[PDB]
Ligand binder design. Structure first.
Ligand SMILES: CC(=O)N[C@@H]1[C@@H](O)[C@H](O[C@@H]2O[C@H](CO)[C@@H](O[C@@H]3O[C@H](CO)[C@@H](O[C@@H]4O[C@H](CO)[C@@H](O[C@@H]5O[C@H](CO)[C@@H](O[C@@H]6O[C@H](CO)[C@@H](O[C@@H]7O[C@H](CO)[C@@H](O[C@@H]8O[C@H](CO)[C@@H](O)[C@H](O)[C@H]8NC(C)=O)[C@H](O)[C@H]7NC(C)=O)[C@H](O)[C@H]6NC(C)=O)[C@H](O)[C@H]5NC(C)=O)[C@H](O)[C@H]4NC(C)=O)[C@H](O)[C@H]3NC(C)=O)[C@H](O)[C@H]2NC(C)=O)[C@@H](CO)O[C@H]1O
Ligand SMILES: *[C@@H]1O[C@H](CO)[C@@H](O[C@@H]2O[C@H](CO)[C@@H](O[C@@H]3O[C@H](CO)[C@@H](O)[C@H](O)[C@@H]3O)[C@H](O)[C@H]2NC(C)=O)[C@H](O)[C@H]1NC(C)=O
Ligand SMILES: *[C@@H]1O[C@H](CO[C@@H]2O[C@@H](C)[C@@H](O)[C@@H](O)[C@@H]2O)[C@@H](O[C@@H]2O[C@H](CO)[C@@H](O)[C@H](O)[C@H]2NC(C)=O)[C@H](O)[C@H]1NC(C)=O
Ligand SMILES: *[C@@H]1O[C@H](CO)[C@@H](O[C@@H]2O[C@H](CO)[C@@H](O)[C@H](O)[C@H]2NC(C)=O)[C@H](O)[C@H]1NC(C)=O
Ligand SMILES: *[C@@H]1O[C@H](CO)[C@@H](O[C@@H]2O[C@H](CO)[C@@H](O)[C@H](O)[C@H]2NC(C)=O)[C@H](O)[C@H]1NC(C)=O
Length: 219
């Protein structure tokens, strides 16, 4: 189980424990998965998606049953296999990002470009620049949110945890349907309960008993 972000990442003055990333409460490394909505014209191929998220064009390719140069239709959610490793007491997958234009912010990079796969808190915590002091050409360490299954999750038969990008209209029940798991199991992984509220544009952990489906459909 990991703590749920609970929209604490939309206010870059918030300092909650969860905004700095998932907590290293299990094995030191593991295979994990991210999700990412294809965006044209900059991030709609395996090369550019894996360049942004620091994966590999063929892992993206095999994970979605496409070729490593297949253009992905805009707004399609694709799975991105990434190595998750403990770092300073946090689970993360290290990636790098050059600011393309002066005017981008830690929040715009976190919520817009990376689609809430990281937080401005984690970006600020792991980069030297002050928030109001960013210029085109600055090179940022990007800690992407991932986690490794706990011994309790591994005992229940979960091999991977997946970071899911929640869209408007979904529920822990409809998301768990995509991956064929108990709606409960999704609530455990994010330390939620039956009455808990799940916001869109906020990443959610999904425990997987097998590899994710090649094509995620209705979200
Ligand atoms: C039948 C049934 O029951 N079904 C169930 C379903 O209903 C259920 O589905 C759920 O239903 C829920 C109920 O409807 C629903 O909940 C709602 O969810 C909404 C979406 O999350 C949510 O709306 C939220 O609300 C929040 C809270 O208020 C809002 O948050 C605010 O957002 C603002 C922007 O939008 C934020 O602001 C920005 O802040 C950042 C950082 O602080 C700031 O960035 C800085 O900017 C400055 C200025 O520019 C930068 O400075 C510049 O820097 C550059 C670069 O160097 C310099 O060059 C430059 O000079 C310099 N300028 C200057 C002047 O100096 C600086 O760098 C930046 N800093 C950094 C670090 O980057 C921005 O500027 C700010 N922007 C602005 C415009 O001000 C603000 O912080 C933030 N507030 C807080 C407190 O966080 C959200 O916006 C809002 N979002 C939207 C989209 O509306 C609702 O509130 C929820 N409602 C309720 C009731 O809870 C669920 O979503 C829904 N889920 C789903 C999946 O649908 C399901 C699930 O349970 O279950 C079914 O069963
Ligand atoms: C978090 O990032 C999301 C996107 O990842 C931001 O949501 C996007 O917000 C804009 C406007 O705020 C939405 O529309 C845009 O503006 C106009 C009006 O619709 C339109 O002409 C443009 O094409 C553009 O889409 C946009 O649809 C919306 N994206 C999604 C997926 O809903 C969001 O503002 C960011 N911030 C927060 C605090 O959530
Ligand atoms: C941030 O949280 C971690 C662990 O996450 C939480 O831990 C529990 C307190 C509970 O809220 C769980 O649901 C969360 O997952 C904190 O580390 C733990 O600290 C406690 C208390 O000292 C200790 O018993 C645990 O063994 C620690 N676990 C781990 C994995 O380190 C951590 O201290 C918090 N950090 C900050 C800065 O708030
Ligand atoms: C992607 O999707 C499925 C496996 O998930 C494969 O579907 C086959 O598609 C070919 C045409 O490309 C058909 O001739 C086969 O009959 C299909 N088989 C089934 C069982 O549906 C497909 O091969 C995969 N890979 C691609 C398109 O490269
Ligand atoms: C992932 O990146 C972080 C930084 O974003 C690395 O953490 C640094 O680790 C070195 C030694 O390994 C320390 O001297 C630095 O102070 C650390 N910085 C921060 C901000 O934590 C981490 O090592 C990287 N992990 C991997 C696996 O590459």
């Amino acid at each position: 189980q990991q703590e749920y972000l609970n929209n604490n990442q939309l206010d870059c003055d918030n300092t909650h424990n969860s905004t700095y990333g998932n907590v290293c409460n299990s094995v030191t490394s593991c295979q994990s998965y991210l999700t990412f909505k294809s965006s044209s014209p900059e991030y709609n191929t395996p090369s550019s998606i894996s360049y942004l998220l620091n994966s590999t064009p063929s892992l993206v390719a095999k994970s979605n049953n496409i070729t490593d140069v297949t253009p992905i239709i805009t707004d399609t959610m694709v799975t991105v296999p990434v190595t998750c490793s403990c770092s300073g007491g946090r689970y993360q997958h290290n990636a790098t990002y050059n600011l393309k234009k002066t005017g981008e912010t830690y929040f715009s990079i976190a919520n817009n470009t990376y689609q809430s796969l990281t937080t401005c808190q984690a970006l600020m915590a792991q980069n030297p620049y002050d928030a109001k002091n960013l210029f085109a050409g600055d090179d940022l360490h990007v800690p992407l949110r991932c986690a490794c299954p706990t011994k309790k999750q591994s005992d229940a038969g979960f091999k991977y945890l997946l970071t899911y990008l929640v869209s408007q209209g979904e529920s822990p029940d409809s998301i768990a349907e995509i991956f064929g798991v108990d709606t409960q199991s999704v609530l455990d992984a994010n330390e939620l309960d039956s009455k808990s509220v799940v916001f869109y544009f906020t990443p959610l952990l999904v425990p997987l008993k097998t590899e994710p489906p090649a094509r995620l459909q209705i979200a």
